[PDB]
Ligand binder design. Sequence first.
Ligand SMILES: [Zn+2]
Ligand SMILES: [Zn+2]
Ligand SMILES: [Zn+2]
Ligand SMILES: [Zn+2]
Ligand SMILES: [Zn+2]
Ligand SMILES: [Zn+2]
Ligand SMILES: [Zn+2]
Ligand SMILES: [Zn+2]
Ligand SMILES: [Zn+2]
Lengths: 390, 390, 390
Amino acid sequence: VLKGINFDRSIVTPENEASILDLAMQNRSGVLDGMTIDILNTTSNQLALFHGTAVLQGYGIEITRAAAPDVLVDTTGQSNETMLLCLTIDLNQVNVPSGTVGTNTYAVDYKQIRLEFLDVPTLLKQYWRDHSLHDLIDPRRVISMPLYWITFGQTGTTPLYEQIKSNYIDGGNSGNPAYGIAARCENFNHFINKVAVQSIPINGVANRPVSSTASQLTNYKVWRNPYLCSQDPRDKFAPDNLVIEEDGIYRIDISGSINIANYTFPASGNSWRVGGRYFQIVCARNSSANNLAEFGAEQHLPPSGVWTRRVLVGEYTAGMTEQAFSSVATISLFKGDNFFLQFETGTNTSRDSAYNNGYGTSGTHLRNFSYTLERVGDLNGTAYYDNGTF
Amino acid sequence: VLKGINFDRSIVTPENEASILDLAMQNRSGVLDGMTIDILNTTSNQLALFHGTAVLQGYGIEITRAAAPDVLVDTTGQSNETMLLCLTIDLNQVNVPSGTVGTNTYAVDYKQIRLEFLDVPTLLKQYWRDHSLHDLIDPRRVISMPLYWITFGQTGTTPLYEQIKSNYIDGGNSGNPAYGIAARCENFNHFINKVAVQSIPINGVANRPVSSTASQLTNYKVWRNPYLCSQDPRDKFAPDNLVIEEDGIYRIDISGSINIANYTFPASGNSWRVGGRYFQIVCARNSSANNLAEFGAEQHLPPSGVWTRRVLVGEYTAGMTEQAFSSVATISLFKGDNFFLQFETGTNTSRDSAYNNGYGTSGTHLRNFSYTLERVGDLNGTAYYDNGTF
Amino acid sequence: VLKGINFDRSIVTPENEASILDLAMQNRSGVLDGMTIDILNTTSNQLALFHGTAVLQGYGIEITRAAAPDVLVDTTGQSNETMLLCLTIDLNQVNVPSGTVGTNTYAVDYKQIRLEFLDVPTLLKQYWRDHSLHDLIDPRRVISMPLYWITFGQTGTTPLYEQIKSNYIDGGNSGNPAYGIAARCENFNHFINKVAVQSIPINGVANRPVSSTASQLTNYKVWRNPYLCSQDPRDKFAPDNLVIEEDGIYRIDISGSINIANYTFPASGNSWRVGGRYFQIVCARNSSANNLAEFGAEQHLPPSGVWTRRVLVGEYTAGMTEQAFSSVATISLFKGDNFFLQFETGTNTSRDSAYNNGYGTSGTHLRNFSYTLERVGDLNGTAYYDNGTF
Ligand SMILES: [Zn+2]
Ligand SMILES: [Zn+2]
Ligand SMILES: [Zn+2]
Ligand SMILES: [Zn+2]
Ligand SMILES: [Zn+2]
Ligand SMILES: [Zn+2]
Ligand SMILES: [Zn+2]
Ligand SMILES: [Zn+2]
Ligand SMILES: [Zn+2]
């Protein structure tokens, strides 16, 4: 029958308002404030955490402050292991109330909530990002959120820790937690290698032209949303590739210029005319490598016929020292994909190349180059096939 | 007096949390999951629907699963008619509870909820998109959401069905249901007709250059959000025009290049110089035709002085074989409007035309052309006049 | 201990659903409908306001309609002063219920809610935009939202009023209240002054080329979201500068063309070649002046190393009459900052200038110029340092 949830005679239940808060959170779970490690109160038998608030699939969880230590987690028996400190909801457990709402003594022992140590495969099997308490097809009773990588040493030592920033809603994303910017950078200058195909380094290090003969690897300001993407973990691909952590339709914006752009000089033989040289800037996706996503999670397989390369800018050099370009596109990306940008031209400098024979500032380079990658849509349901192939 | 809704001594009512869920839904109503037709359990006297969840102006509605058939709708008396299967809320009705919260027997017969067949004019008069239970000026007691076009044949036959996808929150839009992408496409190539003004086909079919003498109508990947826009229903305008289904401020992104671009050849008579040829790419809106919106609904009239054409790219050809362009603009669009893109140039190929005299690959064409149309703002209240004219 | 908020044995409190509604409002407070001044029922002793709804840090406030006047505020004792009419929540007060839920006589005198007159410094000390009832570090018990600037004259006169539009969620922003468009304009034409550095007027008045010898100051359609930005209050900077009212990551889109663009004419001395002229379009931020934000509020100080200028377009003129450009960038902006756009070129018209020696339509100018400024991300927590410098 047709059942009302929010109607005059309805009873508003706990799952109901949890389902409402989950909707209000754009189906994202995470720590809203605090819940960071407290090293001062951390020993070889206990791990301490500061007070804070978290939302796990619409259920509000709080670590209360008093007097510190705000909370203590038992580390006894954990040694010579890398574990995940997890916040877990277990709906098979029973919450035990005590006292009364009449007196001012009502209290609850929330046995449905746990702070625990799990190994990577156990967490993955009950990770909120892949499974749900509210799931249509496979509804779960136990769900977890990883907070920290905890590396325990020998018995009697305090452990090493690494925050799982993808599970903390810190800032930059308040208001649109499941969307917004994935990656962005400030303007940078990058030397064009004398090759037909090359990636543009989008991860914070560019080969900056410094003199008339030399270029040097120089850092530039870059930012990544750890919930949406991360720098490739393999050092071969780390300067150029992003790993996508979340499926969706993304917008890619690029702008910059090609400086010291090559062309065929106007001479009497070519009727005093500029011979333009073809170049293109492409964005690309690649899913050949599995397990690139956080925790080595299984990649989300793209639909059949999915794109791999897309031209953003395709034109000829125009005989000027510097020529500007700009491009904006929406593209489908999948969890576990590599995402990168490529510059493409011919290799014959006297005939078809957009680059010259010079080096450093005297050689062809990208100048004032920048990009923004933003999640703008999801790939749930029908969209996966209708919108996911391009 | 100043009344509190969420305060210590307040009583949180059903309309209250419905108003909260409606806000959390960005004032969009629709089926969240399931509620699709069940043909196997559909006869000539009954129409079956699968289990699912829907939100109608903040009221949660559920069709429960058990044993199938999840729900049955009476089709007796319906013959030789095209009807709308609607989910309706009727606040004039009384919900009948039974049993008790003490025993485990509390149940409700939600007579305020109906699955029914309505004709187009009846649905339009109580459609959630145009009228509201929460409305300030004209508050309603009965509101409906159309789910399927149901075409009943002769007495004794099973009917034909067409899903009303604008009223299903399937995917691509979870998290920002009233906004996001309206339309997007992959890169395509389109031959420029030897005319002064022409539309660029944005609906999935382009006139692709295939040989040195010929171009052929070729499909390209395109996607449309049915809640925001649809392909024009008139075949004359179907390859080029979108119909806007929702008012708002939209962002239009375009990029591509003009290939085999025409110019005046450098000769001794013009001092060995390139004679550039003017062209422009414009976006346009037109509201002369009423009833283009879904169900033939009345168009929303734009404010006085509203724009009709906007230049996105305006420049000269530069003497190169291929020249890239890009443009991004925010524009106001109204429910019932036609939206389209136009390429504009001169008609004299030896003097002012951006196009040449060739055909197919030998003729001037758009190459790597793509666009994204996105809803980025609404036109409610004051914005209608301050932001709605451009 | 781990406390549940939305769990089976939990008690859902007023602060809880207020915290839920605040999240659903993207942490924005404001009037949702009505609450505008009622001049007809306004005397020299009372100020009247129409019925309406407002949300203040998740608490729903309503002014009820009956018979008018919907509400009356005591103006006795207020004379020869500019005051702020404020809606205030005071959690130190006690809400007084009466009657019973059994009979149909339950009512509450919400003493925690006040409509009052405050001076600018008092409002600033308890303004919702800077302080919170839900705040982690400095939780407050009293918070206010300014609705109108009320200027009282001599005793016996009705006052003058100015609506505080930043605190009214009117339209354009329903669904994404804390984000969306900050500023946008229609295409305009603007004469390039014969200087090295100049601002592009983004506030609705351009110096439009009208004849072969003259340009004239002409209005163009522009829109600003008062919650996000305002026109600079100092007349020296009013045609060009915006004041940012809210911190965040913003997207800036620009497009247009440079018409009657200057270049070195091809002659026998330069081997019949076009000598390109360098120009750049930059966006800029400046925080040297404090108190530019609404109510003269203290500016939010940017992180150390913050950007001040960013190149959007950097290239040479290409020998054509008109050359198009486009650019999209994400930038950090802070409350109290000035934001503006600059056109930059050389000053020698016979050597390095992108502009010529002509005036009006015969002189170099921006044609079909437009922009969109949009808030796309916040700068809360860690983002302030990681994302706030660029
Ligand atoms: Zn649920
Ligand atoms: Zn996954
Ligand atoms: Zn976006
Ligand atoms: Zn309401
Ligand atoms: Zn309508
Ligand atoms: Zn948008
Ligand atoms: Zn709170
Ligand atoms: Zn402030
Ligand atoms: Zn945005």
